[PDB]
């Protein structure tokens, strides 16, 4: 009882938290590992994702060696604020939260030999730049880069506690993704240079593939059916001018409605995606089926089946099938 | 060794008064600033502001913090910033800003033996940017960031870009969703007033809006609908059901496109180039339907008391619409 209090009071006598351990003598090596409790939602509109992690950091501080009956000392967060800790920050973090409900979710442990373990529970919102040119058949590698903010490569170096593949552990039920599929993660470390010097950066990349079935049912299938419906009018007799005219214009309106809804399901970007080109081609096909009828009607003087209609019943399904094969082989083979 | 550094730091912080600037009674302290831009995001036309995250470094010399006998630059804990003097630098057009604090407050204090102090901050700030969208979406924007000292004139403090034109880095690595940074500029100037001159730094960009999405979703469908409304001119005048249904369905389609682009696009309550083009196409399909109404009245109403008007329209409508496009694209480009 009183021995613990004595050791706690004796620990901080003469300690200076403003100085890193081994200042001017060696490099402070920090061993880190991450346990991801949940890989939260990925926001396409904001180009960011949320992740809930248990961040663990271990290092050696000779100034905190103690001798006593106990082998491990557990520090109160108030006492943990009086001891130097690495200033680890996330390079691509946008707005992170250090949970303190109902108490600060931090834990500092000291072994008898002066080795400190610092575990904290964090919710990190990090930016994931995306190339949406192949939307909705795109794949991304959302990064998570962290490192020291103030200490250069010559002062503090980060390392993974175990082999890098096994250092970052994701829970079995961790994935909380509706639109993506977490294929895996790669763990690596590198060196960056800024105007303040060289820094060590620890990076983890999570590889996500978007689910395509939703866009197939909501957008691709209705567009294909609408184009087939527009080409169906080629089999009506040429004397039904109001019928084929209403068919053409209402198919154009249906395609316009589908295009607008399909765009409303895509984040607001100003470049052209793959679905934008698919919709534009379907729009061109529906427009052409009506220009074709206008050309058939311009020569309708019993009347025979128009040779324009006969050629269009073959050309339009063939041209649309060729476009479909080119489009899918273009994007499903990347 | 380490105890020597501890006593050197104690001597430096012994008697230091954070209420006095360096060279309090002498020449102004020159403060060099550089910015490393990490990313730009949420360029909002509705709120007329943009959000950027940057590493903001400030160098200045304080002879009170000069130490000898240590050949190393002393990078100290960030909380020592609360024990020193730092410039009262604020962003004039900032609306909401904060310093990241995970896992700790993202700031740095590096001391050099000659007394030079490096004070770095990681700041995410939402800066106001008044945008002129009369040419939207064929527009350019100029968004700035003003850096000023709150309570010090040029007699007390001075600002300059450390490194000159290379002070700001990371601009070319930015990738905005619907923009494209063309160029950026650095301006150092004094705001001259009767009381005195105040230092000011200005970082400005030039944003060029991408047009591909607007081409595919706004202009091309409206052009196709307008061309479809001309099909009525190649149908016999006695096909009342076909020509009326085509005309009024093209009017309905144009209305659908206008209203859905109104909902999809940001709420900008004044006339833009996109609104002018959509209104022009709506007028063209309106006149295309009114032409048929005139033809039908000529043939059936004033008959007892019609291919010429259609032949005339088959040329005038494509020609007038092409001239309208020529004037539109020459005006806004």
């Amino acid at each position: 009882t009183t021995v613990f209090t004595r050791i706690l009071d004796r620990l901080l006598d003469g300690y200076d938290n403003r100085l890193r351990p081994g200042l001017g003598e060696r490099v402070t090596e920090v061993k880190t590992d991450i346990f991801v409790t949940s890989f939260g939602p990925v926001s396409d509109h904001d180009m960011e994702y949320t992740i809930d992690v248990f961040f663990r950091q271990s290092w050696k501080d000779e100034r905190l060696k103690f001798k006593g009956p106990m082998t491990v000392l557990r520090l109160n967060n108030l006492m943990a604020s009086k001891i130097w800790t690495p200033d680890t920050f996330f390079h691509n973090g946008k707005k992170s939260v250090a949970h303190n409900m109902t108490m600060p979710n931090k834990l500092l442990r000291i072994t008898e030999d002066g080795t400190l373990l610092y575990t904290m529970r964090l919710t990190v919102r990090a930016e994931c730049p995306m190339h949406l040119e192949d939307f909705p058949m795109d794949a991304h590698a959302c990064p998570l880069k962290f490192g020291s903010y103030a200490y250069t490569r010559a002062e503090v170096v980060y390392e993974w506690t175990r082999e890098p593949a096994r250092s970052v552990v994701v829970a079995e039920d961790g994935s909380r993704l509706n639109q993506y599929d977490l294929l895996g993660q790669t763990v690596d470390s590198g060196i960056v240079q800024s105007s303040t010097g060289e820094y060590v950066v620890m990076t983890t990349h999570f590889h996500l593939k978007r689910k395509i079935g939703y866009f197939v049912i909501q957008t691709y299938l209705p567009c294909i059916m609408t184009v087939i419906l527009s080409q169906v009018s080629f089999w009506l007799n040429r004397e039904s001018v109001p019928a084929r005219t209403v068919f053409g214009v209402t198919t154009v309106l249906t395609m316009t409605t589908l295009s607008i809804s399909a765009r409303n399901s895509l984040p607001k970007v100003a470049y052209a995606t793959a679905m934008d080109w698919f919709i534009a081609v379907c729009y061109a096909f529906v427009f052409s089926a009506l220009i074709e009828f206008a050309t058939v009607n311009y020569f309708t003087k019993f009347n025979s089946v128009s040779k324009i209609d006969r050629l269009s019943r073959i050309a339009f399904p063939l041209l649309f099938g060729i476009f479909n094969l080119v489009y899918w082989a273009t994007y499903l083979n990347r | 060794n380490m105890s020597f550094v501890k006593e050197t730091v104690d001597k430096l912080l012994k008697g230091y008064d954070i209420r006095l600037r360096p060279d309090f009674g002498g020449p102004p302290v020159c403060v060099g600033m550089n910015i490393d831009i990490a990313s730009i995001d949420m360029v909002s036309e509705v709120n007329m502001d943009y959000t950027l995250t940057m590493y903001f470094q400030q160098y200045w010399r304080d002879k009170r913090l000069a130490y000898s006998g240590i050949p190393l630059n002393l990078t100290l804990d960030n909380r020592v910033a609360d024990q020193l003097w730092v410039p009262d630098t604020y962003f004039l057009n900032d609306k909401k800003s904060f310093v990241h604090g995970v896992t700790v407050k993202n700031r740095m204090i590096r001391l050099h033996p000659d007394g030079t102090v490096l004070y770095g901050l990681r700041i995410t700030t939402t800066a106001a940017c008044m945008m002129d969208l009369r040419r939207y979406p064929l527009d350019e924007q100029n968004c700035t960031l003003e850096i000023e000292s709150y309570g010090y004139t040029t007699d007390d403090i001075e600002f300059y870009w450390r490194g000159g034109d290379k002070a700001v880095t990371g601009v070319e690595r930015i990738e905005l969703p619907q923009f494209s940074i063309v160029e950026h500029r650095l301006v150092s100037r004094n705001v001259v007033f009767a009381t005195g001159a105040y230092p000011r730094l200005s970082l400005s960009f030039r944003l060029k809006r991408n047009i591909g999405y607007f081409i595919l979703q706004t202009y091309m469908p409206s052009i196709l609908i307008t061309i479809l409304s001309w099909v009525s001119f190649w149908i016999n005048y006695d096909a009342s059901a076909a020509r009326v249904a085509l005309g009024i369905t093209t009017v309905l389609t144009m209305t659908t496109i206008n209203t859905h682009l109104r909902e999809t696009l940001p709420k900008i309550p004044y006339v833009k180039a996109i609104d002018m083009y959509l209104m022009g196409c709506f007028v063209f399909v309106f006149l295309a339907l009114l032409e048929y109404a005139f033809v039908n009245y000529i043939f059936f109403g004033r008959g007892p008391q019609v291919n010429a008007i259609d032949r005339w329209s088959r040329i005038v409508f494509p020609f007038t619409f092409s001239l309208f496009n020529l004037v539109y694209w020459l005006y806004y480009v």
């Epitope: 590698a141 990064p143 960056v192 240079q193 990076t203 990349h205 990347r334 | 690595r173």
Partner: nanobody, 107 residues
Framework: SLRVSCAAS????????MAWFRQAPGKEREFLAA???????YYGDSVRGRFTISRDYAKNSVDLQLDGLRPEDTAVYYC?????????????????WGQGTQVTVSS
């Protein structure tokens, strides 16, 4: 000291990971260095501290600085650019590949 450049045309690689790869005669394709959008530099164990990778985002190009060259480095050098899907060190993750450059070292 040898400097090797790699000019990229037809596409801006501002937000792509640009890497260098070495292919010994008949053995395999070996990862040497890489740099992503955030200027983070990655290097292989055999070339750690020896080779320097730098990206000119304005000119859209990537340069490699080779120092302390050895006869073991005599191989074909390629320039690669990709999104780093399923590891930025695997050659299968890169799509755009340069025609290659031959470097011969004699001692």
């Amino acid at each position: 000291s040898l400097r090797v450049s790699c000019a990229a045309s037809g596409r801006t690689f501002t937000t792509y990971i640009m890497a260098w790869f070495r292919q010994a005669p008949g053995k395999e394709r070996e990862f040497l260095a890489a740099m992503d959008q955030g200027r983070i530099q990655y290097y292989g164990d055999s070339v750690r501290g020896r080779f320097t990778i730098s990206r000119d985002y304005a000119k859209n190009s990537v340069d490699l600085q080779l120092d302390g060259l050895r006869p073991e480095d005599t191989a074909v050098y390629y320039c690669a650019a990709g999104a780093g899907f399923w590891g930025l060190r695997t050659a299968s993750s890169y799509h755009y590949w340069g025609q290659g450059t031959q470097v011969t070292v004699s001692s």
